[PDB]
Symmetry: D2
Subunit: 303 residues, 4 copies
């Protein structure tokens, strides 16, 4: 397959995916009801844009991507012609197969942790593409989305594509019951899904686990993958101690195996943001990012 | 992770995996009770071999691989130091991430279809590594296992690693009830697992589906991946007609989209071996392999 | 080789090379007489910085890079231990082996053509790294130098590394006599060097030749590589017609094989800048860049 | 460029090159006066074969390869259409760009040293493709030529493509005056060409230098590339001592930096074959090949 066709390519969750696929070297086409600066930018980058929906817009497409949600003549034409029609969320999840993917999973804290990771990686000069709220970003980037080696993405356990993400590194911030309905209303089935998620890591991958959560601590011995734990717990690999405040800024000292203690600060209050920073610190440490870029990335994040 | 340690590296299912990891560039060590030509070959290829089991043999290992079978001192030492221990079957499934993987799934016909695929690819000069019965082979190869771009492997729905295979192409020969116990004794759960398996294909991947099976035909509209169907069914993409016998040899004409009809023969009787050949023909055609190599591989496979 | 050591890493021509090697994944160290924001940025990205020159700074280095120009104790230590010491210009030329290299050669017009190419590639979202005056740039980049797939570099026939560049695409704007002394004061030897330079392209490479120059036209039949010619000559593949001025802006229509005529403008006068733009248009066209990015890149270049 | 057309593809020096290009994924066509088993094998592997020479055989070709030397209508058609026509030897030299290239240079000993290297790499399971006498081989291979990661080739200083080889590792066995005519009949110009040859290595490359030759010893300080020296000289990095005979077999002890002494034997007499063996040992050691494979590769080479 070489040509991907987006139905509604100007949508806020669609244009970013099309831009990465252009960056990856694919032929990209898309239709929309109105030309916009979004479709003009995509066209400048090589996308073929159709205004209006008609069956012929899907001619030649190898796969269709359709908006979160079917009588549409492009879709109907693709089905009758046995062209696969994939939902937006699946194509988004698939982008991780082309990059060094960092999946930020857990029921709470994904958005902040993803942003903190992006901020530290940016401070180290790596310009990562990142996914928050289903939207691809690259902060102040001067390039097509997806240009960086790194893709940092929220992994939502309620998303149909959860068990199809192929990350190199995965965080589990915590395991709550918000999305029990996704798994038959059974919290134990939800827990097993996190184990299966972590087993999509390759044996050389890394699982970053918050052991302050008793549910994470419970599934920890089932993860037959390399693991680094973090939290305030005395037995966490990467720990925060001596937590203090100076204004709206929280300071703490981070302990890491075989490293000197490092003082960091973060511009947001609450232990949950200390934990989000610890997760970030584990990932940046494992990736080899300097202490200065870590301090700069955490300290400069607004919110 | 860089050093993989095999406990019982001389085993028939272990030595092949160790050889591929050596071919992939990893540090490989392994212990065994007896030195043999198998451990000498692994040592010639760069493995570090220990005879006898003692805890120190696992020093420095980043991951342990243990036989489909825990009091062992190397295992106990690895657990105490939080080194992941993965079963033989899981490391085997993981090899597909490094290669152009062809997963031959289905309840019946996996062994023959894999062998025919290997035989056709071999005839085209591609020397594939292939997995039948959990043993890695490359036929008459003059090289380390895994040297080819291609890895062709049986994908068994009863294997715990089934949903962790990451193939480029997947066959489903048929869906039977043999392994219902793996899925709570529920055939409908078993069917859903084949759908989830096919969704591990990337959007550019290929699903090769035998539509003569009513169960395969049922799940076909759920496969949101590129698909080629085969069988004797009049509506299959790739079909066999004019089936005849001349000795113990079965002849038939294969019809393929946008190709002229091609006469082939196979040295085994029964419509099930026609179907095994059709699956092979679909995969070889999609890979660009010549008619000559297809004819030669199929006719030259003994049994 | 894994550790590269720069003697005088803070210099304006050294820091850029060190940053790209960091981006490529190498261990990079460097010494300098004074810490500066340049060395602090390099340290943030993973460089090990030494202040002051002492023999031990070179310990562990696999290669040393020294500034354009031996009594230095780091150099002397490396020579005594048979570590290679490569000049800045050679390490710079070597960066092209890791990227899609575009070598802008010719006696005149290298700086402007390199800048125009970078500007058009930037407009297409490709954020190229480019080398003008021996200095690596990525204009308004949010990343380490070298992050882009593309490296656009002046290729100076007076540089000792000229015949060691390994580009994917090479321009020859013109062949003048400025640097005859490099070649024994013999213009015919200088012409032969341009032929040998173009033969460092791979057979899949591209030579972009300005046939308005009679010297380029002379060596053209000797280039056994894919070639696209440009200029005002009636027989050029890519030509400029209908040249006009409106202010300090020059307008013209570009003819390209199998394309519709395209109107462009450039914010600098003179036929030499029409030619610089034609070279840029040939490279952008062959790389697949849209007409809109070409028009925007050329029109937005100040000077 | 994607389609390469061979004029005389069945010739002994052409078919091997076409097979590697097929293995690399290119479209390959070729013409010849007679069908043979050689053209049938190429056709089985995906080559398009034309019988007879007519201009139309060159249609669609991006480059033509012609045997070791124009009235041919395919050549004339290509020249008239500005399709590059490259000689067999230049395309052969270019294959090294796709592989881990080992260039065996020096006036004497190239054929034996190449065969010994290939023999040792084969014993280590690497099935290398190698070039002796302008012919591509892979010994008893079950695969297309070029399938291995490694390409081992004689580098002849009289070959027009000498300074266009892009090896990762280069041997210089000795520098004699046989080919002074290639270099204006000036031995000093010949010496300088070997220096330029070694500078085509990248800074991470390796030069393997026989310092028993005083000419090699003379140019050694000009090689600003990683270097390992070998020979009987007391100051060589890798040395042979205790040379003895047992039958028609020559035994000696090889000393290597930071390794225990290793006894090896070879089936051919003369110090020149000790030197050919030392060169092989340097390359195999640097590539990480086990002592067992070295001993087996050297001991099993017939002659
Ligand atoms: C923006 N933001 N960022 C967060 N980040 C994390 N929050 C949690 N935990 C939550 C409590 O949630 C559980 O403990 N629920 C599972 C019980 N099995 C929490 C709340 C307060 C203090 C400490 C912990 N742990 C984490 N570890 N690493 C990262 C991380 C949390 C939030 C909001 C709740 C404000 C949305
Ligand atoms: C060695 N070998 N190779 C085989 N190959 C295939 N056998 C089947 N089918 C089985 C019947 O099994 C079902 O149909 N069961 C599922 C019902 N939902 C079958 C049996 C006889 C004739 C036709 C089909 N279909 C296929 N398609 N492509 C490949 C393939 C089969 C076997 C043995 C049974 C001898 C072990
Ligand atoms: C900034 N800038 N940019 C330039 N760009 C190019 N200038 C030339 N030619 C030079 C004349 O130089 C020769 O023709 N000398 C070789 C004779 N064998 C030229 C001068 C005036 C008008 C037209 C051509 N041709 C080219 N082709 N593509 C690009 C290109 C030139 C210059 C300066 C001279 C102002 C430094
Ligand atoms: C098959 N075969 N294999 C060979 N291998 C090597 N032969 C040489 N040397 C040649 C003498 O040649 C010079 O010394 N000429 C340069 C003077 N500046 C030589 C001859 C006899 C004993 C020792 C050295 N040195 C080497 N180093 N590594 C490899 C290597 C040589 C030969 C034949 C001559 C029989 C063709």
């Amino acid at each position: 397959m070489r040509r991907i066709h987006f139905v509604g390519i100007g949508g806020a969750g669609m244009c970013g995916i099309a831009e990465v696929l252009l960056n990856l070297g694919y032929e990209v086409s898309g239709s929309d009801l109105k030309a916009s600066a979004v479709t003009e930018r995509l066209e400048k980058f090589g996308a073929q844009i159709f205004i209006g929906h008609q069956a012929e817009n899907a001619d030649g497409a190898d796969v269709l991507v359709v908006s979160s949600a079917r009588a549409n003549p492009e879709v109907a034409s693709a089905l009758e012609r046995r062209i696969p029609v994939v939902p937006r969320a699946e194509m988004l999840a698939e982008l991780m197969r082309y990059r060094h993917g960092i999946a930020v999973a857990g029921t709470h804290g994904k958005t902040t942790t993803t942003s903190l990771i992006a901020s530290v990686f940016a401070a180290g000069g790596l310009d990562p593409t990142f996914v928050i709220g289903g939207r691809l970003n690259a902060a102040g980037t001067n390039a097509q989305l997806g240009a960086s080696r790194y893709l940092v993405a929220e992994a939502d356990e309620s998303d149909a594509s959860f068990l199809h993400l192929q990350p190199m590194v995965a965080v589990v911030t915590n395991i709550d019951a918000d999305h029990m309905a996704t798994y038959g209303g059974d919290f134990n089935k939800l827990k097993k899904t996190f184990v299966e998620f972590l087993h999509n890591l390759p044996f050389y991958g890394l699982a970053v686990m918050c052991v302050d959560d008793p549910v994470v601590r419970e599934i920890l011995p089932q993860i037959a993958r390399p693991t680094v734990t973090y939290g305030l717990s005395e037995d966490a690999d990467v720990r925060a101690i001596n937590i203090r405040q100076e204004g709206m800024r929280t300071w703490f000292t981070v302990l890491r195996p075989e490293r000197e203690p490092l003082d960091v600060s973060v511009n947001m209050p609450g232990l949950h943001n200390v934990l989000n920073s610890l997760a970030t610190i584990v990932i940046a440490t494992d990736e080899g990012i300097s202490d200065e870029a870590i301090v700069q990335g955490l300290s400069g994040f607004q919110g």
